[PDB]
A paper describes a structure:
The reductive dehalogenases (RDases) are key enzymes in organohalide respiration, which is performed by a unique subset of bacteria. The RDases are cobalamin-dependent and able to selectively cleave carbon-halogen bonds through reduction. The RDases can be split into two classes: (i) the canonical respiratory dehalogenases, which use a halogenated compound as a final electron acceptor during organohalide respiration and (ii) the catabolic respiratory dehalogenases that occur in the catabolic pathways of non-organohalide respiring bacteria. Structural insight into RDase function is based on two enzymes that have been crystallised, the respiratory perchloroethene (PCE) Sulfurospirillum multivorans reductive dehalogenase (PceA), and the catabolic reductive dehalogenase from Nitratireductor pacificus pht-3B (NpRdhA).
The NpRdhA variant K488Q was previously reported to lack 35-DB-4-OH reductase activity. Crystals of the K488Q variant were obtained in the same condition as the wild type NpRdhAN crystals. Alignment of chain A of K488Q and the NpRdhAN structure gave an rmsd of 0.179 over 680 residues. The only major difference occurred, as expected, at position Q488. An overlay of the three K488Q NpRdhA monomers reveals multiple conformations of Q488 and adjacent residues S422 and R552, also implicated in substrate binding. The K488Q crystal structure confirms that no significant changes occur to the wider protein active site. EPR analysis of the K488Q variant reveals a sharpening of spectral features upon addition of substrate, but not the clear cobalt-halogen interaction seen with WT NpRdhA, suggesting non-productive binding with water remaining as the fifth ligand to the cobalt ion. Thus, it seems that the K488Q mutation disrupts the halide ion and substrate binding properties of the active site, likely a consequence of the disorder induced at positions S422 and R552, as well as perturbation of the Tyr426 pKa. The extent by which the K488Q mutation disrupts substrate binding casts light on the critical role K488 plays in this enzyme. Unfortunately, crystal structures of K488Q ligand complexes could not be obtained, despite several attempts.
Residue numbers in the entry: -3 to 697
């Protein structure tokens, strides 16, 4: 039994308070400043180590600590208290461990800092868990924590400073690698740390931490420093049990009992199988032109004029997403190599693939992944041709390292799924995963093993079969999304392929096929009816619930009451809170088939998927012509929808686009292939049932 979960829900807790119970700490109005440095590692990092890679990505993010400042619109809220809450929530959303605000005095902006800056958003990121000595990959990680954590701080400072700049206010990010103000001094004044023997000590962050700061003239309500002496209250019973929905005081200690390479969720308790729960006929799977990605189809005109127009901006309507974009786009040149590499003898003992897998897994979790799985990168997982030159893509690497980034339950529980924070929920997981995989792929290359990552911005593999084969999800009704037994459908994946030899994981079986046969919630709640209410079909050689990717693409690119859409992730019953009750309801789903229908039905009865306005922390801002304003057309504020009735699965008719109905390999964005919807509808009426496939396959056995 895993006992580290929260006993208490955070459903009434606003996001600006964060996962720690900082409001229950002893505070005073001021404290006398005193010299102090940030926590540093206990050991130095060898040439076997990560260090050079996390320093490169910190240097990349440094490029975006300052930037162009948008014109001021008329929709930025005035209240410094609301601004504070929104910015603090923004920082926690990007996984700041601890956040605070303080006023800048003249002494701070007397340096290179812009002198119009009056306020500082201070935030700390806790050191990562490191492998114990003798565990695989320890020497990859030992002594890199300050730079790994500094990278993360530089990332968050870059995004948050750009978010404020896109709202019309000059803002500059600061971290150890590039600061114009005294970080430690502001960490104390903002109430994140105290000083002990000249080193910062923060409550709750027992592992050490590193700092980032965003200074700005954007006026904010300030916080107060910690009581400089004596017990702050960190172990009070309310904090220890986390009654307000916060991190239990025992969770750190319980966590450290598991090996780092196993992750935080108990995937070891999920049944493994040699073949996936759904049928995969490799000899019948054709490789798809990357020009068949319907975003690429929309870009090239295949879906009409409006989809073409909006393809570039649809996920970048919101200033927060616009803060992430420079990082997303400029990480692409660093994704890695396709040519074979000579082993360089760095990295310690790489002769045990079982140990290499553990080290890559430990490496992922250390860098902030939520799941890691390894499978082998089969040639049919690669696109046939790229979309820009049309040239063939090679199956150049042997293995795929697949990592899931949780999109975030609490933010989505306040959102509609298709409102102004949707694309920011995708894009956050997109850049965070691209970061992590860029760093790991780079470290594989340092060890002389070709490695290349595959981002939202540039992938040469299709993630979904790798998510399946790595045992991170099952085929779900949502269609082009796989569902994980602990975080449901609430994930964005990042992959990097490599030649580094690693033991592969096996597919998982947690009963989801039988569960989805009894559930229609995501299908019922989709704004454009893109999800199938019917049975699974055969599609390009594998069994799948085929969603209508044409309808979904047009909705995500074109709908004007939000930025993109991910509502089908919010509505699934497996989208649950990380509480004892939530894990138990998942356990029951997995272990007790006779209870699945009751859980499916009570998820609607208890009105799960209804919006929680406590959690609506973001501003509704649409950028139009480079200026952030109120939304032109409004804001999706959807709640639970009703029953399409008993016969919908027989009457819904969707379009599918297997390779036959796609642009052929070699086609480029320079060509236009209007989507053949009538053929896609007829195609899907004609699809083989998975049952017939198994019969037909059996006769050639
Ligand atoms: C463009 C795109 C979309 C498009 C169109 C996809 C399409 N079919 O053309 C629309 C615009 C449809 C889309 C929608 C969403 N998608 Co999207 N999509 C992409 C993207 C970038 C490319 C798809 C592609 O490469 N070519 C299109 C061709 C290959 O499609 P296809 O032949 O029909 O095959 C699809 C499936 O059959 C599956 N697949 C392919 N081969 C095999 C083999 C087996 C055995 C199985 C089981 C599945 C499988 O993968 C393809 C996904 O489109 C990928 C990122 C990536 N590199 O995979 C994600 C991605 C697949 N989608 C993702 C997500 C999260 C979404 C959304 C929920 C929105 C969001 N919050 O981001 C919705 C969900 C829609 C749904 N009903 O499932 C995630 C899925 C992660 C997961 N948990 O499985 C991905 C992997 C991005 C990521 N990095 O996490 N997006
Ligand atoms: S299938 Fe597409 S349009 Fe429908 S809810 Fe999911 S993301 Fe939104
Ligand atoms: S909403 Fe229901 S049918 Fe859809 S993926 Fe989730 S469990 Fe499966
Ligand atoms: Na739910």
């Amino acid at each position: 039994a895993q006992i580290s979960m929260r006993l208490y829900s955070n459903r009434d807790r606003p996001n600006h308070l964060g996962p720690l119970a900082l409001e229950r700490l002893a505070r005073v109005d001021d404290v006398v400043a005193q010299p102090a440095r940030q926590p540093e590692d206990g050991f130095a990092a060898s040439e076997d180590s990560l260090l050079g890679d996390v320093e490169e990505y910190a240097r990349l993010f440094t490029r975006f600590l300052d930037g162009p400042v948008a014109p001021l619109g008329d929709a930025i809220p005035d209240d410094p208290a609301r601004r504070a809450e929104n910015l603090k929530a923004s920082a926690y959303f990007l996984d700041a461990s601890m956040v605070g605000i303080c006023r800048l005095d003249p002494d701070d902006r007397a340096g290179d800092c812009d002198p119009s800056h009056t306020h500082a958003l201070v935030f700390a990121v806790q050191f990562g868990r490191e492998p114990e000595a003798g565990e695989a990959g320890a020497e990859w990680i030992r002594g890199t924590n300050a730079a790994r954590t500094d990278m993360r701080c530089a990332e968050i400072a870059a995004i948050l400073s750009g978010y404020v700049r896109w709202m019309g206010f000059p803002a500059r990010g600061h971290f150890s690698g590039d600061a114009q103000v005294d970080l430690a001094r502001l960490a104390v004044r903002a109430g994140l740390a105290r000083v002990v023997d000249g080193v910062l000590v923060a409550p709750f962050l027992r592992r050490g931490f590193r700092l980032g700061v965003v200074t700005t003239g954007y006026a904010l309500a300030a916080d107060r420093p910690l009581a400089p002496e004596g017990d702050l209250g960190e172990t009070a019973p309310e904090v220890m049990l986390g009654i307000d929905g916060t991190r239990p005081g025992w969770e750190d200690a319980e966590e450290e009992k598991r090996p780092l390479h196993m992750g935080r969720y108990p995937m070891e308790t999920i049944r493994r199988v040699d073949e996936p729960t759904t049928l995969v006929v490799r000899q019948e799977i054709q490789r798809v032109a990357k020009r068949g990605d319907f975003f690429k189809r929309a870009e090239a005109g295949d879906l009409g004029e409006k989809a073409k127009q909006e393809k570039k901006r649809f996920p970048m309507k919101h200033p927060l997403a616009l803060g992430m974009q420079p990082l997303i786009q400029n990480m692409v040149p660093l994704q890695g190599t396709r040519e074979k590499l000579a082993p360089t003898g760095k990295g310690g003992d790489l002769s045990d693939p079982g140990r290499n897998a553990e080290a890559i897994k430990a490496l992922g979790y250390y860098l902030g992944a939520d799941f890691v799985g390894i499978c082998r990168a089969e040639p049919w997982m690669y696109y046939a041709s790229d979309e820009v030159e049309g040239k063939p893509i090679e199956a150049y690497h042997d293995y795929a390292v697949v990592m899931l980034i949780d999109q975030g339950y609490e933010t989505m529980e306040g959102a509609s799924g298709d409102d102004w924070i949707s694309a920011s929920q995708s894009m956050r997981a997109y850049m965070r995963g691209a970061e992590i995989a860029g760093v790991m792929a780079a470290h594989c290359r340092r060890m002389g093993y070709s490695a290349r990552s595959h981002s939202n911005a540039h992938s040469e593999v299709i993630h979904n079969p790798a998510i399946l084969m790595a045992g991170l999800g099952e085929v779900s009704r949502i269609g082009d999304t796989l569902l994980n037994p602990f975080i449901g459908p609430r994930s964005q994946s990042i992959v990097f392929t490599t030649d580094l030899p690693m033991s592969v994981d096996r597919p998982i079986d947690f009963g989801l096929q039988d569960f989805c046969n009894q559930c229609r919630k995501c299908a019922r709640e989709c704004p454009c009816n893109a999800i199938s209410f019917g049975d699974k079909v055969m599609f390009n050689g594998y069994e799948i619930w085929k969603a209508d990717v044409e309808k979904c693409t047009k909705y995500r690119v074109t709908q004007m009451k939000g930025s993109a859409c991910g509502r089908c992730m919010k509505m699934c019953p497996w989208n649950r809170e990380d509480t004892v009750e939530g894990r138990r309801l998942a356990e029951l789903s997995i272990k007790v088939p006779e209870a699945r229908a009751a859980i499916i039905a009570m998820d609607d009865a208890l009105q799960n998927g209804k919006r929680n306005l406590i959690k609506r922390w973001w501003f509704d801002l649409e950028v139009i012509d480079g200026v952030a304003g109120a939304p032109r057309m409004g804001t999706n504020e959807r709640d639970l929808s009703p029953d399409r009735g008993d016969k919908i699965g027989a009457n819904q008719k969707l379009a599918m686009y297997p390779p036959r109905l796609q642009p052929p390999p070699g086609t480029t964005l320079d060509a236009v292939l209007p989507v053949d919807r009538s053929g896609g509808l007829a195609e899907y009426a004609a699809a083989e049932t998975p049952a017939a496939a198994r019969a037909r396959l059996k006769s050639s056995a």
